[PDB]
Scaffold this active site. Sequence first.
Site, PDB file in Angstrom:
ATOM      1  N   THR A   3       0.840  -1.227   0.000  1.00 45.88           N
ATOM      2  CA  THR A   3       0.000   0.000   0.000  1.00 45.88           C
ATOM      3  C   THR A   3       0.859   1.254   0.000  1.00 45.88           C
ATOM      4  O   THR A   3       1.920   1.291   0.613  1.00 45.88           O
ATOM      5  CB  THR A   3      -0.940   0.040   1.221  1.00 45.88           C
ATOM      6  N   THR A   4       0.395   2.276  -0.710  1.00 42.14           N
ATOM      7  CA  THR A   4       0.999   3.599  -0.678  1.00 42.14           C
ATOM      8  C   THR A   4      -0.090   4.599  -0.336  1.00 42.14           C
ATOM      9  O   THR A   4      -1.148   4.607  -0.969  1.00 42.14           O
ATOM     10  CB  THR A   4       1.644   3.966  -2.016  1.00 42.14           C
TER      11      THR A   4
ATOM     12  N   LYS B 161      -8.534   2.881  -1.050  1.00 43.99           N
ATOM     13  CA  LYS B 161      -7.922   2.901   0.268  1.00 43.99           C
ATOM     14  C   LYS B 161      -8.166   4.205   1.007  1.00 43.99           C
ATOM     15  O   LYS B 161      -7.905   4.272   2.212  1.00 43.99           O
ATOM     16  CB  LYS B 161      -6.422   2.649   0.141  1.00 43.99           C
TER      17      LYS B 161
END
Lengths: 229, 191, 191, 204, 204, 204, 212, 202, 208
Positions: free
Chosen positions: D1-2, D33
Amino acid sequence: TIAAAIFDGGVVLGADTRATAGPIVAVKDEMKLHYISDNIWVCGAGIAADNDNINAVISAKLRLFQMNTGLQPRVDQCTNILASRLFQYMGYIQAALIVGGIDFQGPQVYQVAPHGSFSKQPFIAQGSGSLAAISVLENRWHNKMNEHDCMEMVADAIYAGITNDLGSGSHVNLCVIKRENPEDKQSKVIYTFYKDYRVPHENDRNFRLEPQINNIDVEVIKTTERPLT
Amino acid sequence: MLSIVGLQGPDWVLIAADSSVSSSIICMSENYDRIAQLDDRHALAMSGETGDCLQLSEYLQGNVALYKFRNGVELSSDALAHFIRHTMAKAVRKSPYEVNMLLSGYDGKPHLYFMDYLGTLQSIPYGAQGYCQYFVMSVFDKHYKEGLTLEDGKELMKLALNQIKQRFTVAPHGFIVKLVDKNGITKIDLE
Amino acid sequence: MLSIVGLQGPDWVLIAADSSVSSSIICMSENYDRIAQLDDRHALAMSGETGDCLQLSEYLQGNVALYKFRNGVELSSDALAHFIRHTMAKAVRKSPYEVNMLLSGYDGKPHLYFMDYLGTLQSIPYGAQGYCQYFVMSVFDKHYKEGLTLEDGKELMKLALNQIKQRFTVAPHGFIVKLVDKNGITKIDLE
Amino acid sequence: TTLLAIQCTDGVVMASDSRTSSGSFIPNRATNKITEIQPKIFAARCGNAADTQFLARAVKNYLNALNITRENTDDSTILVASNVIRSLIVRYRQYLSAGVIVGGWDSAGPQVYSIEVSGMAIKKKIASNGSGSTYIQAYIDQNYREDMTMEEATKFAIAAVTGAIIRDGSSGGVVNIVQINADGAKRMTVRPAQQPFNYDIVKG
Amino acid sequence: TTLLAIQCTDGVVMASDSRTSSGSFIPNRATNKITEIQPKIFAARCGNAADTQFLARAVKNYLNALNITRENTDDSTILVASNVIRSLIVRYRQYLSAGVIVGGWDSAGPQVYSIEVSGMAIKKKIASNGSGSTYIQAYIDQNYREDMTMEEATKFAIAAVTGAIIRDGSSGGVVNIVQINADGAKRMTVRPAQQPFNYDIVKG
Amino acid sequence: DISTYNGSCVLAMAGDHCVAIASDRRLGVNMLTVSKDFKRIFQINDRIYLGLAGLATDVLTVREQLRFDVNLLELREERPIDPKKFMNLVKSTLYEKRFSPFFVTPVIAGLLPETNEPYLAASDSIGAFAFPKDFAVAGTCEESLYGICESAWRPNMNPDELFECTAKCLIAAVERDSISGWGGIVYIITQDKVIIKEIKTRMD
Amino acid sequence: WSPYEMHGGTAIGICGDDYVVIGADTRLSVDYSIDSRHKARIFKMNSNCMISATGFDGDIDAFITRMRSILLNYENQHFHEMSVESVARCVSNTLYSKRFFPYYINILVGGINSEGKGKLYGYDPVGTIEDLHYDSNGSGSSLAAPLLDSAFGTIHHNTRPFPAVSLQDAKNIVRDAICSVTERDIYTGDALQLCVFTKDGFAQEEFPLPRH
Amino acid sequence: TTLSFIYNGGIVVAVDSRATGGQFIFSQTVMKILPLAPNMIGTMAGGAADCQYWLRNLSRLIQLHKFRYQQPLTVAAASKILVNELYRYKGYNLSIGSMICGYDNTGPHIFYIDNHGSRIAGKRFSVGSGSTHAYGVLDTCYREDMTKEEACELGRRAIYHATYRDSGSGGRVSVVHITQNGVEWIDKTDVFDMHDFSKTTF
Amino acid sequence: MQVITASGAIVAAKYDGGILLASDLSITYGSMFRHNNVSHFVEVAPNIIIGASGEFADFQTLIEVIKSVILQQQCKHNGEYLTASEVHNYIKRYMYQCRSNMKPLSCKVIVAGINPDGSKFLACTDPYGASWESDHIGTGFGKYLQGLQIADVVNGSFDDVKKGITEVFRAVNARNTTANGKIEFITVTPQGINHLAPEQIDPNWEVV
Ligand SMILES: *C(=O)[C@H]1N[C@](C)(CO)[C@](C)([C@H](Cc2ccccc2)NC(=O)[C@H](Cc2c[nH]c3ccccc23)NC(=O)[C@H](Cc2c[nH]c3ccccc23)NC(=O)CCCCC)O[C@@H]1C
Ligand SMILES: *C(=O)[C@H]1N[C@](C)(CO)[C@](C)([C@H](Cc2ccccc2)NC(=O)[C@H](Cc2c[nH]c3ccccc23)NC(=O)[C@H](Cc2c[nH]c3ccccc23)NC(=O)CCCCC)O[C@@H]1C
């Protein structure tokens, strides 16, 4: 292998019919697509009892919700209830669910992971055959595909899982949530369940020794009969 | 961890051993001789895996015989005890002999050696290997007089073995008791 | 895992139990009664931790007495067996009673119930809990005749208990044997 | 994830990848997200999707609870959201493995609060989280400017999340951008075709 | 650790931090992680200092062995050094936990070979290794140019290793630079005072 | 293991308007035969029988909890519980213990009240119910029964033929399962009578 | 790290008065994944016998290579091909030679002896040899074993003479058992290599099996 | 379940025939008596491969000694050879429970050998999971002055009761009667046939 | 079986004219996209290429071993190369020997070649030395994200097999975290090994 995609006018959920007792096929015609409401169905991977009970419980919750409130259950509502329930069990209830339904927000397909994570996706595949199914869905699903194209795609995804995954097998059951009138977006959300939408012939028992050779002689120690009352 | 007991006297050593051999919870035999007569003068009571006690006994008896044949003289009780301890120490460094022994001997003078599996050699007036050492020691301590007669020694060994039988949970069905004295090793019955 | 044996006869049940209680490798007592007379009609031989068998016996006997006093009637052997099984099943779900029992009873008809710690209730003609069930069953199987006389039953129970003594590695110093029949529960000596 | 939330002068830019990773499998390659807690409160989510989604759900619940007894619904809502996420991460530290960058706009203006997986809530003008954020740390350091506007911060956030996507297996797919100003939140999706660069920057 | 070997047109720039980390303690803050295998073969070392120093020692031994039976001492020496480091990392995969960027100059010109901790030897024009290299991946991707000269590559390598130093606790101290061209290797030390930026780029 | 602690072998089978439900009679404590009179099949009502394969403890616990439930349901509703309704009751009973499951697997062999149709319902320990139209298998002989019945089962078996395969198809399974066997008992529930035939299996 | 994959697949041998029929599924699968759908697990070893192998495929190949080399050595050093009895003993000895690093493979040596009789030998991974008249190995061994027991009743009455079936009756028993195992075993399917060793020698048939 | 007892008429060795891996009966016809010498057999209990391989190897060693040396190899000698070979693999997790039974110059001999290296001489042994039940039958019904038929029946019944009470024991009792005149393979009797179905207690 | 630097999925499938293999040119260090333009396939003979999915260090070890063995047999046979069958047999033996020495090569190795008899040979040895010959083989998520796209067209026209492999690798790029970069395609045909231009196989991103 369970899957569910959205076509132009609704959702096509699909599932294989195999349930495994470990390495052995416990059930060859198991029902993994479960009615939640007239507008929501949930296919389920994971522990068979977990899926059955979670789907029954959320179906009962939304049936109560629709009876009392008079409101059509929402796909996001079903998904939120499922996600909260699966989260409060911290993934112990191993029900990787795909909630496919239609509400005022159109056709929606959600996945709910056993640990309570959820996500709205145009197409989802879950279960041991989720990767074989999701290859088909990735290469076939497109925006505003028609009901039959999505039916064939989801059936081919379930069949990809059936063929390639040992935990998936037997038949392809589909459910198509649509609206009774595609032109009208306020028309009643109906569902058509295609039991055994695909019955792969190459997966049928090809041979059977009809005069079963049997050399076990049954000796009856005791016979007692009672009326069926 | 089978019960072997030893009781050195003024001119003898009574060496008893659990005579019953078991395969897990099954008593396979009731007259199993765990006191390997390495020599006409030395009886080595052994406590441990039957198949490691047998192999150690065979090796020690063969080496005692080899010493007696190669060199016309026989090993002393002290010399044999130290040879056994050397064997056990080499093993424990390499592959321990899981056998705790009581080497009774009579090379002209009675000898009783505590010999743990590690290679702990200790001349003792009396002793035990197994759990019976927790039951017999006090008996000996409370009843061993210096200069015991052989019959008083037999009564004392019977006392210790009856203490094992009466108070030890894993009580041997019986004991094989051998007298090691100037007459060699003789299986004596304590009655 | 102490040795308790049971032998139901035509009108009696011989219920034996390892009479020796031990604290680890020490035999603390040799006349310990592991056959808790829950009632004048029911003797529950118990095999397990002495302090869990005692507590289970006290609870079961107190509940049998409570049933008899609260309700003028007494529990049947089947009813008492199922009550014990209910207790054991509740426990195993919550906190298992690590006590395997043989419920001998005579409520007008002899009864012998295998009752594992889990809550496995099974009426049996003969049985055992502990490791003695591996030693006595065949004996019973080879020597139990239907309609045994009480003396033939006593000989058969003596046969099974001697099989335990002779072949079981952890051999009880002795057994307390009770006859459960129309005369109630009586400690009988098998000789 | 970023995740990369930038508190700019004129708003907050919350960028993220869209890759949910189940081992080497991407169960959701279009993951959103950045959860909308409120029209102008968003929670960029890192960690267990179940845990972070529960955190977003619970912070929506706690922000509604905050508004049970008050009428200034727009006051301290980002700060309260961060405090609540911190309290939930600390309270469920054993259970929840989740870090949330809660960014957005309230009466106090544009605010980004990084609540680390530890439960450490810190007000940041540039917050980054997730396995992919690691790969872009130096990039952010050398390309983040405190004076970036929401447009400049959006371009920078797309570039940084694209770098993390390229270098991180756990980060991938589209760049989900949320630009929250006083007027509300605008969502953008930078699909791999629209991203400033792709895998080809690796060794070249 | 941060290692960054750039094979330029006119040479190889091997940059590294100087921080040896023993937990949160820096037993050596002036670590020379770029070991001189030969005057123009250098091994930037990542991982267990014992393991990587043994790898450098053993590759010096293997390169001398390579030269026992030949007079073209300058041929395939970087490639053989990489092959040997790969063989040692694979052979001692259980024991050695070490990744070596062997860069330098031989008859074949300037060459950088990254041998990963796995024992994967790959010829690269831009190789990076170590916990710090992670933080600069996107940075490298957006700032590395295949056409960089040894001067340009040196400036870029100093900047990248400085970013990794700033963001990585395991990376710190000076930037040890080795510039290997046909004429030999020049070592430089960029102390924190001379580094292009410092901790102050973090959130600003 | 506790699931194989009491070796079990339960086999329901569908005939022509008749069901069979057979069980091995052994009560075994692991490898020890305690009894050959263990009851695993219980008449739930005149046209429902429940074969409980597994922990004799849980066999009796679930048989008596289901008897409690069915007696209460039949007292309240003043009608016998239907095979489908009893299946749902068993599913509820087994999933009520989802987190502490009974170590018993049920096999419900009944005749549907109106059409006398065979009704087989096999489930796992937590109530995941299959509804085979041919045969339901449970116990430590599960795989053995599956194979033998998959080959052996034929549609429209009359009570004689249905008993014949129940007995043969159970004898084959128990005689390959060391911990199950020691005699069999087959309940043939036909439209008008129940025939309980005790069959000779191997006693080893 | 376990050095095996425990692939699966089921083999079923049935010896007769003049034949041995070993039918094995050809599926090479593991962990719900099918590596191959046609990986023959029955191998003609010589003119006298064949070896069916189930279990880890790497071990199957290693053991079959070792047995082929052993049989070739025997044929060179004895000028007659190894008998089914000798091959069976060699299989036992080879499996036991790895007793402590076993070939996690179950072996069926099915051949014709010098008397023209069908000899079937079942093995465990460590080389136990059972001179049997029918056996089942692999993931579906539990499924198929009761089927062969019913077909022959040898388990039910083990002192009664083996009720040997016709070569085609044995082939049909193996086919039906493999079909049942395929219906219930997830690691059995994709094909049935039904090999028959008679006086005529090795004859292999392939039968489609459910691929789900 | 294997068992072997010496009585006045010779050695009776009765073994079951069940090979059971886990709870699954892999075989009911496995031969658990291996003839080592004309007058000596070895029983198999434990690892089937271990027991059969090592009794076969003991037979090979006995044959080698027989051909090498005129001195007959006693039953004690065969037991010692086997127990030394097994101790050579001490710590290798072998599982042999065997009885080396037979007649030599000194008469009948039974030696219980195991992979642990134990070698116990005795007139009565029983190995295997059902050994306790076979012991219950033997110790109770054994008499030194039995007939050949009575002794064979005693061994047969001990194995049968072990099979009944032991899940790991079953199949057919193979009964061998060793005498000075050699190993007599009395018969294989299905324990299913031995069960008295008239009786209802078991 | 440790895979730190991993080569991603491989999808090989026979078509009329040969074997079409496909794989990204990316090596991933854990989840990181570590190296790019690293062909997962190595041409070991003019008509034998070897790819591998998993530990690329182990693939390099294996390729060194294969090349040494091929060179030995070329010396023996006047430069004649081992057949694809022989090369795969040696790889099977080597990988099984490594799994039996407890130092397995953590790489599923594909051998795609044309045997001298002109028969397409596509085989695969898993890290445990278990090997199999198929008309199409997927390694990594090329096996799992495969469905029937390859099985339905294997041995078909080059365009059909290329399309099926492209579907599988679109699935891989969409759903494999370690999938990075263009998918290089390689045709092993009786006329040699041709490295077709790598293609960026894009997942349908209208899904968002
Ligand atoms: C494609 O990927 C398909 N895969 C399979 C395995 C479905 O066949 C799953 C994942 C499926 C879901 C499902 C949903 C609804 C009904 C049936 C099946 N899973 C199963 O069938 C599971 C597999 C399983 C077992 N344990 C876990 C843990 C985590 C994930 C998955 C699993 N099987 C079961 O739940 C067993 C069902 C069963 C066993 N014997 C039976 C007899 C009669 C009827 C049913 C029986 N049950 C158990 O294993 C016991 C679990 C006890 C837990 C305390 O579906 C997708 C579509
Ligand atoms: C007395 O009561 C009898 N008990 C049983 C258990 C006999 O069945 C034993 C002790 C017996 C010895 C024996 C001797 C000669 C032939 C057969 C049997 N033991 C067995 O049958 C064992 C049980 C077992 C399982 N695991 C272990 C580990 C250590 C010791 C014992 C066991 N069974 C076996 O050894 C299997 C026999 C066999 C034959 N064909 C087979 C096909 C498939 C699987 C197994 C088969 N073999 C294995 O388990 C090999 C496993 C290898 C894994 C790498 O006998 C006395 C008399």
